[PDB]
Amino acid sequence: INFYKDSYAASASKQDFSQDPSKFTEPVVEGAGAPVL
Amino acid sequence: INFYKDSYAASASKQDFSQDPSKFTEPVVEGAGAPVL
Amino acid sequence: SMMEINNTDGANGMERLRVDISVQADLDQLLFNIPLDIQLDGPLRNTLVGNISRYYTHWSGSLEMTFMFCGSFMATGKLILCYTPPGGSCPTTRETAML
Amino acid sequence: SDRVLQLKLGNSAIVTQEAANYCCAYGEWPNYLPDHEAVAIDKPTQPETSTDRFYTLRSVKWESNSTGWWWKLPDALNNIGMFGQNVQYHYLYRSGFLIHVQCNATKFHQGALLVVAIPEHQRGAHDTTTSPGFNDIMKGERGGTFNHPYVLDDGTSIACATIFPHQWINLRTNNSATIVLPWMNVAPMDFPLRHNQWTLAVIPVVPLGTRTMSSVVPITVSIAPMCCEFNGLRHAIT
Amino acid sequence: SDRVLQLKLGNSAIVTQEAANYCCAYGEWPNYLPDHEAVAIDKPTQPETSTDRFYTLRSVKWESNSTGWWWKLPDALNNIGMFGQNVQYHYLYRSGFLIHVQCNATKFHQGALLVVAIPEHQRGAHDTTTSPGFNDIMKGERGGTFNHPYVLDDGTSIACATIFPHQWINLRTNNSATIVLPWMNVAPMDFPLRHNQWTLAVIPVVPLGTRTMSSVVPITVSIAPMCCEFNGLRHAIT
Amino acid sequence: SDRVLQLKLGNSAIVTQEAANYCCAYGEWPNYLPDHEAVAIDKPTQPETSTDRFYTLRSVKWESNSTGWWWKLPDALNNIGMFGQNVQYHYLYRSGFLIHVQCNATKFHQGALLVVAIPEHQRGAHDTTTSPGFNDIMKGERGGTFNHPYVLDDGTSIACATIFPHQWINLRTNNSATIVLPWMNVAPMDFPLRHNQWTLAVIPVVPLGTRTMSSVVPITVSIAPMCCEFNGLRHAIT
Amino acid sequence: NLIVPSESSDTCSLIGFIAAKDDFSLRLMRDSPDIGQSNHLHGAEAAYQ
Amino acid sequence: VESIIKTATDTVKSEINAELGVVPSLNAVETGATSNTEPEEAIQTRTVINQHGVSETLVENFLGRAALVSKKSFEYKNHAHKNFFKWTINTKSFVQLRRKLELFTYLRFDAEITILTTVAVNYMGLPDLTLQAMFVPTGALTPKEQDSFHWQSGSNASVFFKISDPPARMTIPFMCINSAYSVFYDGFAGFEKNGLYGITIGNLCVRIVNEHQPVGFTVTVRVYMKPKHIKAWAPRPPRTMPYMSIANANYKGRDTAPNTLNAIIGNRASVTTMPHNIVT
Amino acid sequence: VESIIKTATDTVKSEINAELGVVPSLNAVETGATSNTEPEEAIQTRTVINQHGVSETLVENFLGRAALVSKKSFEYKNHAHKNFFKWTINTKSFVQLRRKLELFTYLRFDAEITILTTVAVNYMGLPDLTLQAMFVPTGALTPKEQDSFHWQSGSNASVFFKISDPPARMTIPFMCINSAYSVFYDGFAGFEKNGLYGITIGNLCVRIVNEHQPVGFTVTVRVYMKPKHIKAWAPRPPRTMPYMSIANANYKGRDTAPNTLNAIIGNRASVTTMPHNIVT
Numbered sequence A, B: 001i002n003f004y005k006d007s008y009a010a011s012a013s014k015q016d017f018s019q020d021p022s023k024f025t026e027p028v029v030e031g032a033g034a035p036v037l
Numbered sequence C: 001s002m003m004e005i006n007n008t009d010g011a012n013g014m015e016r017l018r019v020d021i022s023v024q025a026d027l028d029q030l031l032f033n034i035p036l037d038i039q040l041d042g043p044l045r046n047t048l049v050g051n052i053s054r055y056y057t058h059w060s061g062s063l064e065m066t067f068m069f070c071g072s073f074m075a076t077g078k079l080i081l082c083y084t085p086p087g088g089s090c091p092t093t094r095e096t097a098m099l
Numbered sequence D, E, F: 001s002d003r004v005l006q007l008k009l010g011n012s013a014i015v016t017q018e019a020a021n022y023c024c025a026y027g028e029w030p031n032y033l034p035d036h037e038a039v040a041i042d043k044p045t046q047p048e049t050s051t052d053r054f055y056t057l058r059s060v061k062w063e064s065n066s067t068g069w070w071w072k073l074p075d076a077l078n079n080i081g082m083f084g085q086n087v088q089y090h091y092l093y094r095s096g097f098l099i100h101v102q103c104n105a106t107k108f109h110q111g112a113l114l115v116v117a118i119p120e121h122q123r124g125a126h127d128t129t130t131s132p133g134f135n136d137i138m139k140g141e142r143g144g145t146f147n148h149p150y151v152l153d154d155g156t157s158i159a160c161a162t163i164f165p166h167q168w169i170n171l172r173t174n175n176s177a178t179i180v181l182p183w184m185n186v187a188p189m190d191f192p193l194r195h196n197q198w199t200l201a202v203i204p205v206v207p208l209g210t211r212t213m214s215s216v217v218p219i220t221v222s223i224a225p226m227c228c229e230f231n232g233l234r235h236a237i238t
Numbered sequence G: 001n002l003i004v005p006s007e008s009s010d011t012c013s014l015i016g017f018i019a020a021k022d023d024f025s026l027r028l029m030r031d032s033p034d035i036g037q038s039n040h041l042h043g044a045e046a047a048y049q
Numbered sequence H, I: 001v002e003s004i005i006k007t008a009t010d011t012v013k014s015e016i017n018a019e020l021g022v023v024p025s026l027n028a029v030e031t032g033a034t035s036n037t038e039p040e041e042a043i044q045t046r047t048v049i050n051q052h053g054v055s056e057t058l059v060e061n062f063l064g065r066a067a068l069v070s071k072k073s074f075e076y077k078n079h080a081h082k083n084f085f086k087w088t089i090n091t092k093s094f095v096q097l098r099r100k101l102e103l104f105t106y107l108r109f110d111a112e113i114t115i116l117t118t119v120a121v122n123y124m125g126l127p128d129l130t131l132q133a134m135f136v137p138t139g140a141l142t143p144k145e146q147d148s149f150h151w152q153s154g155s156n157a158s159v160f161f162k163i164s165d166p167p168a169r170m171t172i173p174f175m176c177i178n179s180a181y182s183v184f185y186d187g188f189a190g191f192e193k194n195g196l197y198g199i200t201i202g203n204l205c206v207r208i209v210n211e212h213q214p215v216g217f218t219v220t221v222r223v224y225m226k227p228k229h230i231k232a233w234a235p236r237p238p239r240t241m242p243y244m245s246i247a248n249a250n251y252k253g254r255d256t257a258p259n260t261l262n263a264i265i266g267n268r269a270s271v272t273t274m275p276h277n278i279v280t
């Protein structure tokens, strides 16, 4: 875990598996195979 | 924690968060926005 | 604690700790300004807040300046103390400082 | 129905009948600074309608050999209307931006403009070790132009610029681009005169072309600050 | 305990240790324009702290033969700070005012100033049929002086001026006067550049006198607009 | 009502009609030594009224070029009244102190004295490596004066001396200062002849000035030991 | 203006003080630039004698 | 929108398609959105339970590697860099680390620092010297000499290590005055116009505490940095032109492709020429 | 009065004020109390939930740093300081530590001692010598020679360490005969008048246990102290004049500002002169 008193001294944090690609791939307001226009 | 038998050998004590500034900032006997005089 | 506002040549010892103001002949007169340098030597450096802060690198929070008038009881007057957030040159007229 | 759009802020409004939906940078939307994120303790001024409105800058002419244009925010607006006034009178500012780039031509014209909002676009100088100067960076309303759009004038590449919030204006498809930018910074507020959060870049990846009657094809930029807040009031740094 | 007072608006504050209570014109207090009294339909801008704060004008010297001074609102402030900016960029404005006139001397000095806020103080010219001109009326920050204070420069009388919101600065008693003025007009809003709601007049009914060391005795005016609202945004009429 | 004050201890009393509230060093108050903090096992003598009373030292004259004065406790009192007797006959002592510095002038006089109680004020000599001698330190009732008040004669600074229990005597405001000092030491008791817990320093940060009739303006110090206890009785070290 | 009668000094002094409020915070400790040493202090070496 | 992804998405079997008004393969690049055509809609797919993990591309891991940030060699001898050096900390001197950091606009992370030391004679053997690395924050006084008072390090953090010990190591917390480090700064450092455009941590001062020996040695100190507890924002176009300065993004490009200002990708005979075409 | 503070206090939104008899911005310095004007009373504020921690300014941390308290170098050779030295312990020799300790009147703390050793030839290689640091309390006999009986250390505490090992380290308990150490002492050491004014722990005796080699070496011992389990009382005005002696607070001041007895702060042209004024 961590034997130091300061939490920032701890080892790496490799458990953040959440993600939201859409903020980069689909930043459009109006959200299938229908014409995008 | 501490593996030595004498307690003074222990690591630092960084948890004393209490304080009373007033003993230095307001050492006056008689305690808002009212005239201090 | 006391700011050494009168850090000028000719002012020795405690003379440097007090700012002398006199009866003016003109209006809206500028009396003095205070460099807010805590890192660079200045009126605020040798103060409790200044000295201790210099043992650190980052600071955050409000400061407070208190001025005590030490003239005679029969002496009267009104002064205006202005704090100007950074951005430009130090104001030299009351019309500007007042903002 | 996503080719038609009307934007209304304050006393200003814009419509377009040939839009391409519209982009919300990083899927965010502008908002005022919440108490739990605030730093400056003085009560801020929120002008609303006098600052949160569309400001239209001078147009530029799209030419056959154009390399592209750019405008830095908030510099481009630091001297326009009440937004500019607040900026000059306050040490700190904060705001989002609604960007609308417009360019129309003919069904016989072709051309494609990449319209991208680059956060912290730190420019680089070409073939020299000397860093860009103040005048190289602060152009104000006029904005500047790209010397080497191929690498976004910063040694990277326009090819990957799409990683940033953007849209395109492809003449056969649409005549305008709309990008909503939220506050983008590592601090809740900033000093408007020495730092630009966003840079609006309009680059012609596909040059303007046609065989019909030749006419001046302008590109116009309209920008509307959003949720403006100002702190640290003092005199104006005109 | 009514001889001591602190006024705080926006980033400005004033204290006085020799006040005489304070006047609320007609017992009213400034307030924003309610929906049931509104006329202009555009959403107004309420700057708050950037405009509702104390602005200190240049002082005047109280002399043995002084006749009195006056400042018209909002003219006196139409070119000061963010208040002035909003006024120049908007067709319509509305606001109350917190007036604080200050003048100190010695316990060996005597003198009495009538400090009165006159609504619609329409000046008159002396010994001529020609109406006062623009420059006779619009003095800005500098303000003007009375030619015949005895009749308030309008053919009436200073003797009955007490019918208007006022206070006095009687040197042996106090060193400041404070008057809170609400919006005073027949319309919910007005055009700030061609009409003055209030006129601040400071007239020495009892001349300044003393037998002690002679020194310059200034009179200073600090005015803070209150509950400012602006409508009809456009370019600035600088 | 905090400008008026009466102090009464034993057969002595002092009143002041121009006080500035009063200081309780570090917010503490004098008290007798509790059993759980005691070290010396002999039953102590608690004289009360014969020692816990006001002792007034010889006055000093505040001059235009004065640098300041100081008195070390308990040295200043080690030879006065019954307090001095107990001190001379006992090896160990313990007590708090009620300090009252007084100085009045005219409403035409100006001057400001910093009245500070410095714990363990270890003096330093000027421009030499030799430590201060016995006579440089032990002045008794007469007390000493500052050579370089600017640095509190110890290489630090009077500017930050306010970190210590203190008050000021600003002639236009008050004519006396009152400081209540509790026992201050790392030991429950001490030998009174070779160690001073507190040092009373009165320094004129703002020199005495006036343009009226010149007269001698004295500064007087009255000190009252509190909760005195003495242990280790033997003969007197006169 | 500063106004005083004939018998008062016509030049007065102000003393300015400064302090931090309780919303203050300091970070990243470093050595103060306010103190230095060029040689041994007197007696420092005699501690070894 | 947001969700936990631990493995690559699976594929679902898809059937034949002939629907009017439905054209999944058609898109509009102008919207700024990336094509949302799924493989299942472009061709007929089978079902695939994809178990490929996505751990190695976690930002924490992508940036979580110790990289060289500083390298300095000096002469350890009698100087009658005098047995110590002062380094104004920056992360723009070595291209490998620099380029990765510059793939992001903002970065918040704690920094693990590792210091590696080596020595060489100018042969009678290698001395096991003791060194002191002192972190002198902005505004603090930097050592003027190998033995100046500054080294007593009363408040500054110092680390003493021997050449025979494993590399020294400690963690520097995320120390920006902001919520994150600005990998890029489109602004100026001061209130005046003459200020520096773009881009202060402080100075790392390293000295050999041992007095000089009768002979000279060359000592080299390598400092490595490994970010951890990482949070990143706004990805950016990768650097292509060679770097020129640590103070800016100035560019010039290679003399010949690839990566010349004129052409990033090397040339091929024509757009119909297949470079490594299989000649069976 | 007393309370637990873990973060900087928050700010509450404040409104317009115009109350008679209420003047929060007015104060009376003469009372000895510091201005109690709150920001909310001086100007109009907004609400701010302040999450700034206050840990780094805890006294335990402010003083909790290992600082150099002693440095001694001597000749290790055949003396036909003879291969050992005796140091009368004190914490007034090095200004960085001294000044911080002197920010308080009284201090109670246990002391962590770390001993760092380095050697240099007067080149055939550096010897991995063994040293012995012996704590000789007040009143005990100090070693007369490198090999005198005193070193058998039957009761004194001694620590033997090699130059190749990590610095030696142990904790010295708070050992005053009082409840706290007196950082300052306004008194004399003896019952007679000829006594010493101001300001005994004992002697730290360090020797090289190895017999001398055929050649000479210079050995330097640096001792560091880190207070812990700290309690402090009565803060004091910081030192401004350079230190002169370890035995007193004597002062002289620099030759020219800053920190000259005549002027602590450097001069500026006048009280209306802004030193680093922004010239836009």
Ligand SMILES: Cc1cc(CCCOc2c(C)cc(-c3noc(C(F)(F)F)n3)cc2C)on1
Pocket: H069, H089, H091, H111, H113, H133, H134, H135, H157, H158, H159, H170, H172, H181, H182, H183, H201, H204, H223, H225
């Ligand atoms: C932008 C940006 C800024 C940073 C921070 C880099 C911090 O790294 C430094 C710091 C602060 C300290 C040391 C350091 N080396 O040694 C020590 C010790 F002495 F404190 F241990 N500190 C080394 C580097 C490279 O990362 N990106």
Ligand SMILES: Cc1cc(CCCOc2c(C)cc(-c3noc(C(F)(F)F)n3)cc2C)on1
Pocket: I069, I089, I091, I111, I113, I133, I134, I135, I157, I158, I159, I170, I172, I181, I182, I183, I201, I204, I223, I225
């Ligand atoms: C005043 C004041 C007094 C102090 C106590 C300082 C104690 O430090 C000493 C002591 C007592 C022991 C050693 C010491 N070094 O080595 C050993 C060992 F041999 F016992 F391990 N003890 C070193 C110093 C500086 O702190 N402030």
